[PDB]
Amino acid sequence: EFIVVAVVCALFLWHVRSALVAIISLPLGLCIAFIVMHFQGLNANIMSLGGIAIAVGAMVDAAIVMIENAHKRLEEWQHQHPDATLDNKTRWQVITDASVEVGPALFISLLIITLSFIPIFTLEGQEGRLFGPLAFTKTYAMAGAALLAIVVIPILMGYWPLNRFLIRVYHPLLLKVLHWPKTTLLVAALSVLTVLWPLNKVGGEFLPQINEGDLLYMPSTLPGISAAEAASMLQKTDKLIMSVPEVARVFGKTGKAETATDSAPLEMVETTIQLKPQEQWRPGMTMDKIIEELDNTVRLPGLANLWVPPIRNRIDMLSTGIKSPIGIKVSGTVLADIDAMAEQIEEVARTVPGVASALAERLEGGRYINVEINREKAARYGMTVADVQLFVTSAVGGAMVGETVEGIARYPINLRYPQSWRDSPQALRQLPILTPMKQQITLADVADIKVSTGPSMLKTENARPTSWIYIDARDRDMVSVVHDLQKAIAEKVQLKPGTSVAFSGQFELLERANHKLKLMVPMTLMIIFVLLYLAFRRVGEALLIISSVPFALVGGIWLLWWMGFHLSVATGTGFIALAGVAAEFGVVMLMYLRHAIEAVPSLNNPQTFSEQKLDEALYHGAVLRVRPKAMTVAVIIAGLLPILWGTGAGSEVMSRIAAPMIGGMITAPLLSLFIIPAAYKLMWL
Amino acid sequence: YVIFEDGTDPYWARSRVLEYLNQVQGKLPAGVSAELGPDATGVGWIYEYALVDRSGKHDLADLRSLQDWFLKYELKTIPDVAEVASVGGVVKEYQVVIDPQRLAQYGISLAEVKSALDASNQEAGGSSIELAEAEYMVRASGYLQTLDDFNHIVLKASENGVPVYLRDVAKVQIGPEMRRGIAELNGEGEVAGGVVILRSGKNAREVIAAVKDKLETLKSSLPEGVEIVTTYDRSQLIDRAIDNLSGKLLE
Amino acid sequence: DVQVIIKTSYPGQAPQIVENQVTYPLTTTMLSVPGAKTVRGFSQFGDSYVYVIFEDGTDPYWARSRVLEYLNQVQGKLPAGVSAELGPDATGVGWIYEYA
Amino acid sequence: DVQVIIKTSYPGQAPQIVENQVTYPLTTTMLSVPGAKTVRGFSQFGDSYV
């Protein structure tokens, strides 16, 4: 990004030392940002560096503007007086005057950017913790850049073909626009109204699928399997997963590790598949196709396959508890009603075209061998309840009795009967019982043993039983399938008194972030308007240039639709950031145009029917002011194209945040170039 | 009661008292154990109600059990309700009274009766077998459920003879535990009630609103004839004071 | 988020018994801790786990110090041999390195 | 400095037993406390200080 920005600056100014003066603002801004975030206590991660990479161009624009202005002033001075006659005194004077002529506007523009992206600190929770560092570092970098531009840049600027084509292409369009401004504003309104077409096709999700070098495999199955069978299933599924050429290691495991952070019982597979470096396969096999091949290769009837990254999966399980991205919780107080409702919902969900699989957790899926100890019979032989259940807690059981020490180690002891006495319930009814009377009897003479069903594990959220339903959909959108499931389970499934249904997982966080972003726009607009009145001291110009963000939004959403991205929190942040850049471009344009209209033409209008010289002032404000705007737009787009076309680690979020800004910086400036002069001419009359 | 200096964190004090509690626990008697108090104080008694039954049907011992085992748990879930206490009523107690004359005839001492009574209320099964198809968990009964179970336990086994049952030395019955608190309404008679205690440093109006909403939405699940009559409510004073101050400011 | 794990062991007790005598008094007691956002909890044939997740902007150690007090307050009601042990100072996302 | 003392009593146990069963699990556990600079510890015929 730094290299490309330097190249663009050197190609636009065609002066090496000017390019150096322009780019020296980036390293010092980076240094200031790093110092401030070290003082605060942040570390270097994807978000911080992403914020700095996003702020690169927004911090170089203000310096290149002043550099171009000083260039023009020096050129004019040289054109006025003979060459080969100069000294440091007059040069320093003219450079300082040229810098002061345009400093305040760009300073207030950088302040606009900063304090208009500041309102994103209101995010709370997962998205807040994710986007905190980004906003922090972006604000720090922009503040340092503004400080340097208003303090340091003049000093080292005083110490140290293409535009003709732009003018030739701009002249006639500008004239024909100034001829009729009303029709121009009308076609602008229509170009804003034509935004409703892509908004429907753009999807919706919480966050992009940030892919890493590994991925988890956690299938859902019934708890009715043994230990040896579970180990055999693990072995066969691991050997089947290893059959894919993009797998280096496979470490499968069932049950739990010896830690409190793992509560998984047996019958629950959790494998960690390690993928080879992506430089070891055909450059056309993405992660989605690898997941598809894995899903198609390890069918293994009896499992509901699920593939997710480790970090994201564990963060989801921590924040919500549902491993899958989409999930439905059925609450209530009765277990039978909850189980029936979960079964119904699970059976209805797998008919949605986008869903790939759906599985509900059963509550009553546990087999019990109930031994009702009759107290009358147990008393007839003279033995308490404890004495008759010791024959099943220790003989048929094997509970621990103690532990032996060996240096530092310790190992437990067991005690139980042989295996031939726990074969079948009929083998229990024949258990030999040595009564306290030193007698021989069976277990059927003192207790009735039968087989039944009941709860295997009781999950309760907020002290209320709940049943979770895991949904898996990889082909269709997230919000689309969520709305489809809502409609389906609200149409063809009837509720029962005492039970509720709630969508959880990514959808709750998505809705929270959506509400926050929806209520966050007014603050940004108000800050922009305040800082604009602070610079132009008029409400007219403030509203004039603040009415330019809609074009930016239209362009951003169009580019989002064109690139195939979905609407998420990253795109929201992108729009909240693009608003400020659009406002900054409008400020620059209107400031230059205003100086133009202020200098010459304040004399002819008092004589009515005088519009010939009013257009020449606008022309002058669109002949001398064409290079700065083109340069700002070029550097803004060039400092963002790299992170847009980037394909690496963590590039998903940055590309999603950059796409809206690059989309808007092509539509808002191109339209502003014709809407600002038109509306300003209309306002001056 | 340990009262601290001014400007002290309400939680720093508890965290510092826990350490000295641990330090002194090593010196207390065998079975004594010092338990910390709740996160509220005496001034936290925000809301108080009484469970009235104008039908002469539900006895005094049922109202208190209903309170303790339903409302103490339904209201405790409110965000900032530090505690819910029960006042008045009667607690159900299994009283086994022994006759000296009939106890001497059999020649049994009280120690054996106690050891046999307090050794038949365990429930634990710690095995796991396989039925040739899948896992099979192992249970084991042992909980005491009804009264006849108390008369069906044997104290000593007579070799080839009628063993002595608890029904032979001691008779069982239900009774009221020694009452520690008595409550009563206007002039009618004793009544069981509850007391909501708020957490130190939180707003009372929101807690009262939530408590009233829950007690209202629970009015359908209560038995027929039982009603909850409020005896103390602090929201009325809050409303009156706020209205008075607002009117004063306006005038 | 800020999560505290409470793992209790009840040797050989059906899920319902361990849920009535161990998990319920813990899930209903931890909901009164200052700053507790939610309290998940599930009991198995011999164990009971309770996850207390707190609000945003809460000290990771203040939460543990405040959960210890309510753990002590509820310890007097648990069964004879049951004892609730606090969890480690990490969470599920803390699984950094794994070897075989 | 900020010092915390942990005194444990094991009646009548040779230094090695009290060091293996009492002092070692304490010295190795207290080294994970946030902010613990060092953890000294020694066990005697009946006691263990950390």
Author numbering:
A (entry chain A): 345 to 504, 516 to 1040
B (entry chain C): 94 to 344
C (entry chain A): 44 to 143
D (entry chain B): 44 to 93
Give sentences from the paper:
The Escherichia coli CusA membrane protein, which recognizes and extrudes biocidal Cu(I) and Ag(I) ions, belongs to the heavy-metal efflux (HME) subfamily of RND efflux pumps. Typically, an RND efflux pump works in conjunction with a periplasmic membrane fusion protein and an outer membrane channel to form a functional tripartite protein complex. Extensive classification of the single-particle cryo-EM images of the CusA-Cu(I) complex revealed that there were four distinct populations of the CusA particles with different conformations that coexist in the nanodisc sample. Our data allow us to propose a simple model for the transport mechanism of the CusA HME-RND pump, where the CusA protomers can independently and uncoordinatedly function to export metal ion by progressing from the “binding” state to the “extrusion” state within the transport cycle.
The third most populated conformation of trimeric CusA in our cryo-EM sample has all three periplasmic clefts closed. We obtained 21,108 single-particle images for this conformation in our cryo-EM data set. The cryo-EM structure of this CusA trimer was solved to a resolution of 3.20 Å. Interestingly, the conformations of these three protomers are identical, presenting a symmetric, trimeric structure. The conformation of these three protomers is very similar to the conformation of the “extrusion” protomers of the EEB and EBB structures, with an “extrusion” channel observed to extend vertically through the periplasmic domain of each protomer with respect to the membrane surface. We, therefore, classify the conformational state of this symmetric trimer as the EEE form of CusA. To test the dynamics of the “extrusion” state of CusA, we added Cu(I) to the binding site in all three subunits of the EEE trimer. In these simulations, we observed transitions from the “extrusion” state toward the “binding” state. This transition is similar to that observed with the monomer simulation and occurs independent of the adjacent subunits.
